[PDB]
Amino acid sequence: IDTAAKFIGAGAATVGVAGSGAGIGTVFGSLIIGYARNPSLKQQLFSYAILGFALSEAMGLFCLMVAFLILF
Template identity: 70%
Template sequence: MFNEVILNAAKYVGAGLATIGLAGAGVGIGTVFGSLILGIARNPSYKDELFKMAILGFALTEAIALFALMIVFLLLFAL
């Protein structure tokens, strides 16, 4: 009984720590689009190229967030 309580506590602590990756992804997405705005403000003629790169950066950053969320769900529901 005591071991089960310890296991559940460790599971919830681990899931909480894994959500830090979601906050980091939020910061990364903000940085990507902030840089896009600055780049377009400096040189509007490169708008299309900068937007393509920003979307790629957004997708890669969001993939990291999804991996972190997947780890959280694995910790909570698979163990």
């Protein structure tokens, strides 16, 4: 029964990380739009984008770490 505990639960947890892929893609797309509007703030635009992407992927990786915990 532990096989289910380590597989079905962990798989359901794995959805969380890739769910935030939409968020990081949103960050990058908004970076595209911002660069289009003002192609001079890229040094700060990119920095803000990196910050946001880092936070979103960190959320995803948090869910993924919980998934790993369920597996082990």
